[PDB]
């Protein structure tokens, strides 16, 4: 079947700061919450850390070769924070700003459009100190960050997001404990939430009162969840399971409330949203788009016992990648629908891929399930698109094998492998056959 | 996650007597139309027969020995029509009956229930020539058959089919002429569906009239399709696709009448059903339970060109089998509900595998691929007997490798490797596994 | 047995413009309709184009020391026509005359006699849109062309074909829509046919006038089949299928009149060539060679359900190639000796080899097939000059894997391994065996 | 392509008694000029003999369960002369015809008819004492063992040969030294020949005048040469291979003459053939077919110094058999039209196979190059029933691997691999291909 794609697609790639740049101490950057988590014995698997990852401080202008080559349209990346401002208040940091001129100006001179994350994790530690997304004062932190980045690349910068998969920051962070700052207290969750959202809206403000260029909006990771039977019970766990990922954010900012059932669920176990007056009408700041994070699909049912959401996902038998996650790709089709009650708003998938592990042999890296699953999920993107949803790109996560959080590099997602020992970049198979499909600007499917 | 099953929950296999029986002018069986199709060059990929098939007419005690081994309940086998009534018509071959006699008394002495499908595809030749069941004589033909097996087997076999895969008798041979007898007439394979169905409704009578012992039913494979876009006409495709494989068939028995829909969509074609005064009458007796042969699901669009429902399936990237067919086992949940039109009626999962074509390696058939499929469709099993359906028992597809159909030997589905060259069995790591399902009668799904 | 060929005969490789060079848009290459043809979902396997190729617009230089250390004394190539007239019609892009005259020095500095072939099937899009060879107008926008070349390249060049396979730029083209611009129509067709004989006789007579050096001919493919039967049908349908291959552009050049038989059955078909006054005598002008493209031959009866010649090829068992083509090299030798109805003419061997699609293991292609196919062939080569025939050299297809049209770069050619990831050149093992006979002028076929 | 054959096509395997049978000094088996010429150092390789061969003296029975499993019609074996007679002369031995009697009635009771032959080269050595065939003594002396096999045998053979492969008795084995009795010596050969001719008519007069039943011929190893060059010199030493093998002895039998210009050539070197008078008449006794030994093709031209034919063939680079013997086909399409000028008689191919060495890995003999031998050389056969000539079966030379005369073991041509450690017989891949082939009655090649 061939899938053929509108002439103004927008293919990409991604990746994020901590995850990929090479050079943790130099010129004066700061230390973000995910040096100190990394450094930490026990939160990163094997003690990895970001302090070399890719070494994409110093190898971007390679990368930026690649993706040349791969015929791609855009690039999101994000912004170290603590390059900018070392402290997150203080005076900015011009060799900072530098390094992200030296990458943008070389994108434009390519033809590839930035697509800019603000938020990507790397808190400044010396906010954290302060108490970090619990403290109203991280607002005025980012906002001031937010302004310098707006005025910085006014020109050059055309897409911008301002937080990246808030569900993570917040509640995978704060509640859950895995990711830094690794607290496990569900109203500091709440807290980090609400707080990173007038953080947004405010920003948002700022670009608007700015006259920057572009378009801004904000990237929430979503989830998808299905009953496992038909009762009422599974289905309240399925609506719980979903709602705090996309709805928790999408509903403050589109429909001016939290999700009250939510509310009313964390209200049982004891935990308030810091909702301060006049907070709720600036998370409503009108946003041009949305990015989508998708990886995954699962059926869940009710269980009391299943965290503090009581939803608990059934193990199906479905095939899993590397990382361990099923592919059923029908769940980015769903999630597109299921938020259109917000509108047919503009849409674009700024993460979607696989964990799948293959390696270097005889000069290539024969990652045959990393094309499949991608062929797959970009069915579902024609297939949204031909039922007239606004879906108007797609960023392959990721062009490089990086720095996979709590995984560690363990855990490969590129379409370019890269050694880490030596950082030799290899293009793996899906890479030729993205190429294809982005140079084409049709997919088709065949046995 | 562990899914137990229900105590009574009844574990088979399954086999039809054309595709597994070694002997095809052994003790006077007649021709049947799948001797002649097979016969035929072009007919059957690389002109393979069933003339020797697994010569399981000969060694059916081993196949019952390692059956009984498997810790199953059921055997799921056909009837050889042309063995019995070796012209379809005229007097009983008592050799034709010593053999399934030998069958059952070891399946019941080894404490396995037999599940007998009168009508697996073999009409007599004879027959055929007079036009098959085209003609309404075929039909009276059936019941004195299915009365002689009644008769015969009375207190032996408690539970009956009456034909196997109605869609396939009718449309697949009659209309698309993949099948045997091989026609490619609509009027034809309207004629043929409901000349079956008459015959069907005959039997049931004839066997409440006797007294005989058991259940009896029909055995439909069940389509399930999924519209591409959310436009009515590619759900008007999809409901096409769906109804002509079971609605078509199970409406006149459950309901008194064929689907109206479809009735008018063939009419367009200037097609009509040939039904005499008082034929829905029979067609609507009682039924104790039906069969649901499950294998594949699909994405459809509406297409003008796509055949005489006009209806396309969308190569939507997924893995397949062997035969290439892809895995998506949520069709059988979502048809088990679809069903429920009918009533909370009893089903039995009477064919459910995959065409995994895996061979001997170090004395053993590595076929991990069937594990997963088989695993992935008893979970969706578990899940609609735990919303309160009637789903009885579940036989695999496939006791042994055989003959199938217009793909020969080429396509294996059997949990027992069976080397056409040797005729040795060789038991296939989903035997084993299988083995433990039945046997501990819950299933667990493990990383 | 040692096969000496002639002290001055002519060892060479080929290429054509599209297949290799690697640049569609650089200095103002206008599209031709082969970019089209490619740029179109379903035109070409895998959405496979020449838009980079081999790169050959950058890497002629390594090509051509590549092509010195074989000890090749030619080189068949392509001139892309919309490099040199980007419209087709208009103005002259001096861009696209000094890529030629790049190549063309280097290969005369390296001792290497350019083989020029002004048309291998790269119509600029432009004329395309007023019809292309299906109008007049693109005789005349050819002419100047050829023309333009004649007097660019006037002492550069010594060997001039005016078109590449005239069979399949007609009827493969037009008729069978395989090919680009992908028509299906008789008369379009042989309109294409018998317009781009006139352009031929047109542009021999402007070599003339002008005093260009050289000599000048034409390269249809040749086909050869041989009767399944003794039938006179069969032998009509074998008569069909050689004569239109060759025939039919021949007998116009050389004898002045269409084959009638060939012209019957085209009328028969309602087709008639779209001859005007004057034209066969245009055609008929003197040419000094044909170069021959030789691949392979067939055994045919008579099937009127065989397409527009209904002359059906038989699978007769033969091993074939891994694009599907039965080796069976005698028909070189029996086309050689048909074709010898024109005369005892100067022939070369201007395409000859094989799709053996190895790849680099161990720093090596082991293309064992490729080395025995050419052997094959070489033996009929000398085997003809020893009965006299005037055949004058042989230029291996293909120094490069590359562009196989609708194949995409799927089906290898070449004798030099192409990495398409890296542009990396791998000299197969049929190149060092190619190198020994070139430079030997003998070969020797061993047990 | 479907190549369906005629409903009483005969197909088969064939074997000689030396090369199979297990038990040269058993039940009083006199010494053949083969057991000599195996014992002597040099003449065979690696001093190979058939003491053991495949033990089919022995094992009979296995092989006869082996060609009933593969479907066959007939059996061609030959008669051990010197187990009849062990000395050629003297007096019966019934063991000798105990054991043709024992698998002779193997066969009938299985419907595989015999098809004997009388002599395939094991002459006693008592008569090759006395001169062999170079004596007329040894005509009476084969009369007499013909006589007592037409009547021994009369109701259970109704197919025979009196001679297999003329040119290698005669010329192979006289001229040549290559075979038993190893002589290099023309007027010797030519002696043998037309003494082997008389004894031939003076056979067929027997059979005729005792009634026996079925049919006899004659089975020559029929060559096919093609001129490398269109000379006539070429064209007469093509002659020359080509007609010594069949027309040497095919036309004093079907036109009562020696062949002119062989006549002519011979006596040029100073042999003439011993002719008396009434021998030629005695010659030109009626046969009712022939049976035609092909394998190979080749292309020759004259050379003074290439034997005493003076007939070189020409290494055209083809493919061999691991014998290495270049296969091309046609050759045997060619040859059986050729024969066309004795009439059109009835002939089968009572040998036809390949030299294909695969052996036994994981249980297997994956002898594919043998399939596509076969499968080639049967499209040959099926052309020539549809061009109508009377061409009745095909026997696959070779039931098993056996001793291959001056090759020993070394060179297979089994569709049965033998370890001749073990006796084991394996039935290779070619063995299943055939069997589908002789049952299903229809051959299809496919890519």
């Given at each position: 079947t061939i899938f053929q794609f509108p002439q103004d697609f927008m293919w990409g790639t991604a990746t994020a700061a901590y995850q990929i740049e090479?050079?943790?101490?130099?010129?004066?950057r700061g230390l973000s919450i995910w040096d100190t988590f990394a450094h930490?014995?026990?939160?990163v698997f094997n003690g990895?850390?970001?302090?070399?990852?890719?070494?994409s401080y110093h190898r971007y202008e390679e990368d930026i070769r690649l993706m040349k080559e791969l015929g791609i349209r855009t690039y999101r990346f994000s912004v170290s924070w603590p390059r900018i401002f070392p402290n997150g208040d203080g005076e900015v940091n011009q060799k900072g700003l530098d390094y992200y001129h030296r990458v943008v100006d070389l994108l434009n001179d390519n033809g590839i459009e930035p697509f800019c994350?603000?938020?990507?994790?790397?808190?400044?530690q010396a906010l954290q100190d302060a108490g970090?997304?619990?403290?109203?004062?991280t607002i005025q932190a980012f906002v001031q960050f937010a302004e310098t980045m707006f005025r910085e690349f006014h020109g050059k910068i055309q897409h911008w997001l301002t937080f990246n998969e808030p569900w993570c920051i917040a509640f995978l962070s704060?509640?859950?404990?895995?990711?830094?700052?690794?607290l496990t207290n569900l109203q500091t969750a709440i807290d980090v939430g609400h707080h990173l959202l007038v953080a947004h809206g405010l920003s948002v403000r700022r670009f608007r009162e700015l006259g920057t260029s572009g378009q801004i909006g904000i990237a929430p990771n979503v989830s998808w969840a299905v009953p496992y039977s038909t009762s009422e019970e599974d289905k309240a766990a399925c609506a719980r399971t979903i709602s705090l990922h996309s709805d928790w954010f999408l509903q403050p900012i589109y429909?001016?409330?939290?999700?009250q059932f939510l509310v009313d669920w964390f209200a049982e176990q004891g935990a308030t949203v810091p909702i301060q007056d006049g907070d709720m009408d600036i998370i409503g700041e009108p946003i041009d788009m949305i990015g989508i994070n998708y990886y995954s699909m699962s059926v869940n049912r009710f269980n009391p016992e299943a965290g503090f959401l009581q939803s608990e996902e059934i193990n199906m038998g479905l095939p899993v990648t590397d990382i361990g996650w099923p592919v059923e790709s029908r769940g980015l089709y769903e999630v597109l629908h299921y938020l259109q009650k917000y509108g047919n708003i503009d849409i674009y998938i700024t993460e979607n891929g696989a964990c799948i592990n293959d390696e270097v042999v005889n000069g290539k890296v024969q990652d045959d399930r990393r094309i499949s699953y991608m062929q797959q999920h970009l069915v579902q993107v024609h297939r949204t698109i031909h039922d007239g949803?606004?879906?108007k790109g797609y960023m392959a996560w990721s062009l490089l094998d990086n720095?996979?959080?709590?995984?560690?590099?363990?855990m490969r997602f590129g379409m370019i492998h890269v050694?880490?020992?030596?950082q030799v970049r290899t293009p793996k198979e899906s890479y030729y056959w993205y190429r294809n499909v982005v140079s084409n600007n049709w997919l088709e499917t065949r046995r």
């Open positions: 090479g050079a943790y101490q130099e010129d004066g930490t014995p026990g939160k990895d850390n970001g302090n070399v990852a890719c070494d994350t603000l938020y990507h994790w790397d808190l400044p970090g997304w619990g403290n109203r004062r704060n509640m859950l404990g895995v990711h830094a700052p690794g429909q001016g409330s939290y999700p949803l606004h879906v720095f996979e959080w709590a995984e560690g590099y363990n050694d880490f020992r030596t």
